[PDB]
Amino acid sequence: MIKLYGAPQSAASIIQWYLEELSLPYEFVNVNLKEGEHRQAPYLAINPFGKVPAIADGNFHLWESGAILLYLAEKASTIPADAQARALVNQWILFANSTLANGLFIEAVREKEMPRLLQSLEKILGRSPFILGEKFSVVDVAVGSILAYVPIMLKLNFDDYPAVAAYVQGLVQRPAFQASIGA
Amino acid sequence: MIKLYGAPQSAASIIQWYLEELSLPYEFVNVNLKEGEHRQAPYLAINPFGKVPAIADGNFHLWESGAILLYLAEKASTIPADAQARALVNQWILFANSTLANGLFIEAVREKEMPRLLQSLEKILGRSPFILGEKFSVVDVAVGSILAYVPIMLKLNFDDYPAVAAYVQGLVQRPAFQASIGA
Numbered sequence: 001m002i003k004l005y006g007a008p009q010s011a012a013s014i015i016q017w018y019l020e021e022l023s024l025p026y027e028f029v030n031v032n033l034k035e036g037e038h039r040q041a042p043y044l045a046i047n048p049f050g051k052v053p054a055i056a057d058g059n060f061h062l063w064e065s066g067a068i069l070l071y072l073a074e075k076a077s078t079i080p081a082d083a084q085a086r087a088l089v090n091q092w093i094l095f096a097n098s099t100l101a102n103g104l105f106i107e108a109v110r111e112k113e114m115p116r117l118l119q120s121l122e123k124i125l126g127r128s129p130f131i132l133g134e135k136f137s138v139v140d141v142a143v144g145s146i147l148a149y150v151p152i153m154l155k156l157n158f159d160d161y162p163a164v165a166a167y168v169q170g171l172v173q174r175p176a177f178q179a180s181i182g183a
Numbered sequence: 184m185i186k187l188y189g190a191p192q193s194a195a196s197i198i199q200w201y202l203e204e205l206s207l208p209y210e211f212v213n214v215n216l217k218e219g220e221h222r223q224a225p226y227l228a229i230n231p232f233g234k235v236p237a238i239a240d241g242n243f244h245l246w247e248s249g250a251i252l253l254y255l256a257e258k259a260s261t262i263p264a265d266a267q268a269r270a271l272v273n274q275w276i277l278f279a280n281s282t283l284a285n286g287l288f289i290e291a292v293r294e295k296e297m298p299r300l301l302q303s304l305e306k307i308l309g310r311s312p313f314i315l316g317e318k319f320s321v322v323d324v325a326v327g328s329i330l331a332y333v334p335i336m337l338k339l340n341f342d343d344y345p346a347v348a349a350y351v352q353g354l355v356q357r358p359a360f361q362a363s364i365g366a
């Protein structure tokens with residue numbers, strides 16, 4: 001089965017949420033970051049950059065939480081997808097991991113970036129229940145996790161963005177979220 | 184042909200570098216950031232977050248430099264046709280856009296992050312000419328671009344990482360790099 005390498009307060013929890021949404025079994029392998037287990041040869045053979053999360057699926061190893069989400073989304077796909085459909089999912093995973101995370105969590109750019117990012121998402125989320133439309137997808141796990149860590153880590157809220165706040169509340173109340181990030 | 188929306192000193196030159204490597208024509212469209220053209224309705228209809236680069240491939244619109252690089256690579260038939268082969272390229276594009284760019288360019292984490300990132304890249308680049316092995320790929324455009332911007336922006340060099348220095352020097356001399364980022 002999928003082996004997921006993680007640690008507390010890492011993006012491994014985001015992979016755990018998507019694994020809960022897909023109802024896929026997996027092995028959780030804790031990597032002791034406090035004792036530098038991630039900086040030693042066995043873990044460096046899984047991720048040469050010494051970061052969690054990572055997965056092993058047989059002899060296949062994969063790191064970067066975003067690429068793990070896209071990989072799990074592809075393996076669980078029923079209807080074959082083309083380059084454009086994968087590109088729109090990849091666009092949002094890249095966005096969650098760079099533009100969105102940086103704009104919310106980098107103190108020097110937050111005052112400028114964060115209101116703009118939330119204002120743009122407010123328009124999207126005010127027209128559809130989820131990022132890609134009516135149906136929840138891996139994009140909501142990627143963008144939603146970054147947004148949910150805003151109250152958790154920044155002590156900030158989404159009161160000025162009612163549609164963003166309702167979307168984040170809805171994500172937080174999903175049993176798959178409560179069994180993973182919410183635990 | 185692809186319409187590429189860019190600006191000087193943006194990641195549009197990275198997309199242009201890859202289009203030149205693929206020998207693909209493109210229509211470059213400048214978005215005047217200094218005059219706020221990226222925050223106007225026509226550009227917001229291409230990228231609702233008002234960032235460059237973005238592409239239009241007929242009626243298909245796509246933003247995030249990383250997703251554009253992955254889409255162009257898929258379209259050009261340079262990645263094998265399976266979820267594992269795509270996940271490995273995705274891993275490197277996400278790494279370039281998040282882990283690598285943050286560790287090199289964010290001052291509060293550079294002291295701890297940069298030597299570890301460069302030491303791991305040095306080991307990889309000491310064993311093969313390019314990140315995936317013998318052949319140049321979109322991974323070299325994504326990772327190599329970030330590395331080439333280290334002297335260009337931070338005034339740092341790779342004197343202590345010989346394989347990284349030689350790799351960057353080789354990338355900067357490629358005709359497609361000179362026709363785009365080097366121009």
Ligand SMILES: N[C@@H](CCC(=O)N[C@@H](CS)C(=O)NCC(=O)O)C(=O)O
Pocket residue numbers: 009010011033038050051052053063064065066097277278281282
């Ligand atoms: N872009 C990466 C970031 C990974 C990352 O920053 N992981 C941290 C935990 S939050 C880590 O393993 N840090 C250990 C270290 O840098 O020594 C991802 O999304 O997977």
Ligand SMILES: N[C@@H](CCC(=O)N[C@@H](CS)C(=O)NCC(=O)O)C(=O)O
Pocket residue numbers: 094098099192193194216221233234235236246247248249280
């Ligand atoms: N993660 C994005 C970053 C894009 C980005 O930050 N673009 C800048 C130019 S370097 C921009 O358009 N900034 C305009 C603004 O922030 O208003 C990507 O790689 O596409």
